[PDB]
Design a protein around this ligand. Sequence first.
Ligand SMILES: NS(=O)(=O)c1ccc(C(=O)NCc2cc(F)ccc2F)cc1
Ligand SMILES: [Hg+2]
Ligand SMILES: [Zn+2]
Length: 258
Amino acid sequence: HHWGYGKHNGPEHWHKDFPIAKGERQSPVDIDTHTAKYDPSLKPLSVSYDQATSLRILNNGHAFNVEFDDSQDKAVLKGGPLDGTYRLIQFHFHWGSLDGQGSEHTVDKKKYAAELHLVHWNTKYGDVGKAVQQPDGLAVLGIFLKVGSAKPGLQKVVDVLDSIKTKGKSADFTNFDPRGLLPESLDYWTYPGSLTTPPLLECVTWIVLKEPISVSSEQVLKFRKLNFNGEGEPEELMVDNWRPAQPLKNRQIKASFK
Ligand SMILES: NS(=O)(=O)c1ccc(C(=O)NCc2cc(F)ccc2F)cc1
Ligand SMILES: [Hg+2]
Ligand SMILES: [Zn+2]
């Protein structure tokens, strides 16, 4: 039926309805530190989030998205391996049922407890809908989450979850500052890929930060109390909403640091 992360409609089944699943530039992939090419020409990243306007938070089955007003250049991504301005539209997480799993990308086969995806679209295309038809339409800033000390900036997201427990719920989520979710350093790995959920369109330039952010056990625990199901249906806990790594094929992972 509609895809999911279940035994019967999971990642291994995705190819039946989305043929692109066995494509050439699918994501996520495993980051092998000893094979990534140090590309000195890669420019530094430019993250401008001071005029960011968060609007809503919703549980769409699969995961929960915090949406941003992208009608103007309020929160943008420039620099690095990118050419042109990219507007932040939404961010979401992928997590597991246990701390030792949850991330989509792995570093040398190592899984993190979760992974934050900050989704941006290429402004030259006009709207996100057009962006997804171009090979360089999207830019997703990936940030790993490891369990340790609590991340203050993540607390606002954690407290509102009780109100979007099931599929289809949403709640006003204004004045959220995404800068509170960035680590100290902006060192990154970059490679050409795709969305990690159906439609699995190969329209993404991936930028994975080297430094992970740390969150408390109680913070990620509250993520795990969300539901895949809508109100009134049997309860199915929202966990392990991650796609396993894919073959790199004819692709090069470039590092911005030595
Ligand atoms: N985990 S990830 O960063 O790769 C990712 C980011 C965004 C989306 C998304 O916006 N879905 C909607 C959507 C995307 C399309 F490409 C076409 C239609 C559509 F509704 C999906 C996956
Ligand atoms: Hg595309
Ligand atoms: Zn994602």
